[PDB]
């Protein structure tokens, strides 16, 4: 059970979630073993205090049997351990979380939820005066390259990718002269055909696209695009457009992808304001928890690191200030479980005085 679709459904007791700040490079990862030891120390002490020593010992030996072969030279940003009385699942995440221990019925999966909510799937259109390429990219990896062996190009009414610019002027025949200065018009029409192929492929999937290429090529394409509202980013400082591989292109578009995610988080503020005006936004922790538990909330807006402990009972729907170690984690779990959405807004865009908001369904 290494996935979010299994952690939320393994409802053990006690369910122990341990988070360790790890490092990818040396000697920063030199203190990763010590951090792991300290987190397991507090885990053992709390488990003995809250439960029996036998159930602390079985859990800790199970964690140790899996962490004894851990290589700390291959650590990502966070090491998450999900331990039970019977199973232990440890996963490495490129997300940064604050080191903590959560002992509850369910596994603390708000970091997995945030990582999945930050997911961006997009197209990369790589332009050149000589060719066009199309890549499908998920977050920071290439999904596919759109070459000859693909299903999405089987039944195509346009030129399939990779598209060569075999214009009559490029080969030197066809009925045109260089003294006519038609080259810009030729580039515009070639990019128009490229956009035709892009739209044909996009109609079956409908994801935002990033335009990569020279500034002039991007210009011509933007003026020629049939659906220019779906364009979310343009990068003109990416190198080796014709020979570099898809992973290299996706590596080079990551700054623009992050800027796009930031723009989405900025846009979320307007919807929060609309809910506040319509009287459908709850910002108190008690009200937010009650609405989330009774399934009244459609969107949650957390401040990306707003952990809070409280006394929560699901009988009178009360939340008194400190117990549950992550009351915000419980709110996120209820919102997700009742078919809602969770948005983890950045700190510089959501105030620390009001770090949680809930757009309710009524």
């Amino acid at each position: 059970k290494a996935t979010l679709k299994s952690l939320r459904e393994t409802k053990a007791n006690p369910a122990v979630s341990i988070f360790v700040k790890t490092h990818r490079e040396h000697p920063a990862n030199d203190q990763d073993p010590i951090a792991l030891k300290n987190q397991l120390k507090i885990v053992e002490e709390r488990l003995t205090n809250e439960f029996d020593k036998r159930t602390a010992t079985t859990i800790l030996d199970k964690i140790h049997a899996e962490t004894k072969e851990y290589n700390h030279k291959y650590n990502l940003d966070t090491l998450a351990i999900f331990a039970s009385v019977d199973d232990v699942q440890l996963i490495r995440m490129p997300l940064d979380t604050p080191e903590r221990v959560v002992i509850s019925n369910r596994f603390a999966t708000r970091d997995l939820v945030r990582d999945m909510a930050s997911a961006v799937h997009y197209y990369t259109v790589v332009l050149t005066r000589d060719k066009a390429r199309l890549i499908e990219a998920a977050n920071d990896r290439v999904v596919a390259e759109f070459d000859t062996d693909n299903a999405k190009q089987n039944n195509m009414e346009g030129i399939p990718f990779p598209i060569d610019n075999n214009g009559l002027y490029t080969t030197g025949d066809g009925g045109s002269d260089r003294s006519a200065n038609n080259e810009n018009s030729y580039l515009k029409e070639f990019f128009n055909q490229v956009d035709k192929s892009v739209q044909e492929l996009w109609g079956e999937h409908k994801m935002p696209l990033v335009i990569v290429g020279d500034v002039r090529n991007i210009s011509y394409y933007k003026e020629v695009c049939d659906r220019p509202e779906n364009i979310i980013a343009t990068v003109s400082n990416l190198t080796e457009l014709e020979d570099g591989n898809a992973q290299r292109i996706i590596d080079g578009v990551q700054d623009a992808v992050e800027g796009y995610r930031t723009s989405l988080h900025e846009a979320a503020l307007g919807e929060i304001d609309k809910a506040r005006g319509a009287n459908a936004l709850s910002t108190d922790l008690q009200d937010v928890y009650r609405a989330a538990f009774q399934g009244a909330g459609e969107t949650l807006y957390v401040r990306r690191g707003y952990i809070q402990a409280a006394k929560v009972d699901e009988d009178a729907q009360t939340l008194t200030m400190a117990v549950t170690d992550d009351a915000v984690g419980l709110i996120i779990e209820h919102v997700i479980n009742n078919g809602g959405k969770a948005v983890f807004m950045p700190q510089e865009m959501m105030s620390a005085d009001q770090p949680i908001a809930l757009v309710t369904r009524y």
Partner: protein, 84 residues
């Protein structure tokens, strides 16, 4: 040539005509040696009064009138030269 479509498929050959078919039709006068049918195989068979060459050419063995008929158990087309 934008979609890579137009390409090599070389077949511009054909043989010369052979000028086959029926030369003398039914009921016509014919003199011995006159060719009646030029054919590939026995599309028509030589009945009485007409012979067949090595290329299945049907020719008149004697003077008379050309007759076409379907006859025999195979329902074969036969050409005859009747002494009329």
């Amino acid at each position: 040539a934008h979609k890579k479509a137009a390409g090599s498929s070389r077949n511009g050959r054909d043989s010369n005509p052979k000028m086959l078919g029926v030369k003398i039709f039914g009921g016509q006068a014919i003199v011995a040696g006159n060719i009646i049918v030029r054919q590939r195989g026995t599309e028509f068979h030589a009945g009485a009064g007409v012979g067949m060459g090595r290329d299945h050419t049907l020719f008149a063995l004697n003077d008379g009138v050309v007759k076409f008929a379907t006859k025999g158990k195979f329902n074969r087309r036969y050409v005859m030269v009747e002494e009329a």
